[model samples]
Target: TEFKAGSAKKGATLFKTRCLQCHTVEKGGPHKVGPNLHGIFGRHSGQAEGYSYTDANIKKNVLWDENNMSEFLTNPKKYIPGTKMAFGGLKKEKDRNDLITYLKKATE
Candidate 1:
């Protein structure tokens, strides 16, 4: 969506600092504090095998996409209350955009 204007380069840098600690994007990778994010786009929430998700996330039942992900990144707890994710939401729209842009490719 809005990530069309985002740079994957910037997203990669942001991911290294923000998401890498909690998640992994490589295919079939091991889960970290969060689930491995490979193919996250278009996937159902909380479906990653071997990872225990909070009830809120398991019940979200939403498909992952740019629009939903953008909103989630703006505020994780607000998006899915009771989610076990611990990172504070990304406040900058540009950063979210960039990160999603990077993830779009990296996850594939």
Candidate 2:
């Protein structure tokens, strides 16, 4: 019932390769193609400062928990229709877990 433990070391590499083009995890970092992801784990979806989100994302108003994040990571467009996130999702479960673990730490 819980998320599996993952490697932040590997996750960091995964992030640099896959997510860095769009997102920044530094606290108060400037928003990229995606929003700055600081403090995202517990934050509500679409609430990033100064980031313009689609109406669908804002209207959904879901909390960013591990379960929801994992689901979204499997397929972003399908999970949230009309979202502007263009990257194809991480299909590998290990990849998702590693990225999630990295996000949980880095975005704090």
Candidate 3:
């Protein structure tokens, strides 16, 4: 399903409020608890700068396609067992969809 880029703007707000504390996307932003997600969608998993991730994340060889991203956002630990990301996963499907839209747009 194609998503409207406009919807990503709203998703950005949700990301800032819910996710910015841990993750960052803007250039030069510090890696707090998670890595800078500046170009995550097409990027490979466990490849973000300065963040040491689990072997599982590296081994999973994940590409942030819509389906995989949706599943990962719904259950981070279950998706990558041993990942250092502590987020319990956003439960709402709409929110997850929007978040992925936001990430795709913002990272570009």
Query: What TM-score do all the candidates reach, one by one?
Result: 0.94, 0.95, 0.86
Q: Which residue segments of model 1 deviate by more than 4 Å?
A: 1-3
Which order, best to worst by lDDT? Answer: 1, 2, 3
**Which candidate number has the best lDDT?**
1
How do the residues 1-108 of candidate 2 rate in per-residue lDDT, one tens digit apiece? 657969988989999999999988999699989899888887888998688999988987879987788899999888999899997899998999998999988988
TM-score of the candidate numbered 1?
Answer: 0.94
**Candidate 2: lDDT over CA atoms?**
0.88
User: Candidate 1, clashing residue pairs?
Assistant: none
What would the per-residue lDDT of candidate 1 be over residues 1-108, giving only the tens digit for each residue? 355558989999999999999988999788989999999999999999888999999899879998789899999999999899997889988889999888998999
Q: Judged by TM-score, which candidate is best?
A: 2
How much lDDT does each candidate structure score?
Answer: 0.89, 0.88, 0.81
- lDDT over C-alpha atoms for residue 100 of model 1: 89
Residue ranges of candidate 3 with Cα displaced over 4 Å: 1-6
Q: What is the number of residue pairs that collide in model 2? A: 0
Which stretches of candidate 2 lie above 4 Å from their native place? none
User: Could you tell me the C-alpha RMSD of candidate 1 in Å?
Assistant: 1.1
